[PDB]
């Protein structure tokens, strides 16, 4: 199985709402999906796992707790899965990671992740709306 990331970079102004998305590309097989972010260091990588607005990859796995921090983890029937981040701040900038775990019950486990960069801007150079 593969994970597709339609967008590599998301450039948003502050106060806006953004939806980051990933696509799961295809008997006792089940898929577990979630999100996290890289650490805010010099090099951003999905091998680093940090919570998003203090919500862990366990908290965000596929509601009320996420809603309090302006987050919503959701999915489609067509492999698509996403995280909505409301009322964006400069601090939200960084590398975001969508994680998928394929479980063949008591037999095997395979894990794949996708990555996308989110840049939140303010001032003269900042874009008009999420684009």
């Amino acid at each position: 199985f593969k994970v597709a990331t339609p967008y590599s970079l998301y450039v948003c102004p502050e106060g806006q709402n953004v939806t980051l998305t990933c696509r799961l590309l295809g008997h006792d097989v089940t898929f577990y999906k979630t999100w996290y972010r890289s650490s805010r260091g010099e090099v951003q990588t999905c091998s680093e796992r940090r919570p998003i607005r203090q919500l862990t990859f366990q908290d965000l796995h596929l509601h009320d707790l996420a809603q309090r921090h302006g987050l919503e983890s959701a999915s489609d029937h067509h492999g698509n899965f996403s995280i909505t981040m409301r009322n964006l701040t400069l601090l939200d900038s960084g590398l975001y990671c969508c994680l998928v775990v394929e479980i063949r019950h008591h037999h095997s486990e395979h894990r794949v992740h996708g990555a996308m960069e989110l840049q939140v801007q303010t001032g003269k150079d900042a874009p008009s709306n999420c684009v």
Partner: antibody
Amino acid sequence: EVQLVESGGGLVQPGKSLRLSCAASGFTLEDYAMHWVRQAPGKGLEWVSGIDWNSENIGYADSVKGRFTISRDNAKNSLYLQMNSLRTEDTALYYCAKVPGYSGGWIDAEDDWGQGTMVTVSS
Amino acid sequence: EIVLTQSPGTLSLSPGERATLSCRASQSVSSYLAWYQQKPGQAPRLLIYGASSRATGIPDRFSGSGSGTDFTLTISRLEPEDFAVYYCQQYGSSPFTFGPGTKVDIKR
């Protein structure tokens, strides 16, 4: 295909130490809380210790606090149990398990257990 | 600390009957309540997590219910292969101690 291989068990003199190890194949430990559960022959299950994925949250059964130390190495997909000041009461089959507790629901529907390793504390 | 009790200590039933197993907690459980089945010479198997959710591969005849301090495991259409000890365990507040188990015997 999927297994938790245990080792380091066996006969130990009372007051001495033993280090159990539990290594995963078929799946990676990096996302999961891991636990030690023991059972004296013909007795009930007894939770020994638990550790979350990033070694932040750690818990111990009262009777083993101070004497036993749970640790893990995600790069070696291994869970450890350093047992000091061993007593006859510690004689039991020790299981390592990928089960709920410090898991946050990830992934509670799927469990995995080691075959168990016997620890006998005797002179 | 949360202390769990289980009743009855032993249940002896004919196949096809319904087994009602009880788990009581000394205080309200967070629903981070699990049920395990253990057959002789084998590691325990998770049956129920979150008080009422079946683990992967668990048949529908095993059903978990209850909340707070009173939890139930119902095994309908009991089979001879269901001979085991059934343990409850809370995993929300450390130590994650197990209940003393209910031994289910088969009448024949």
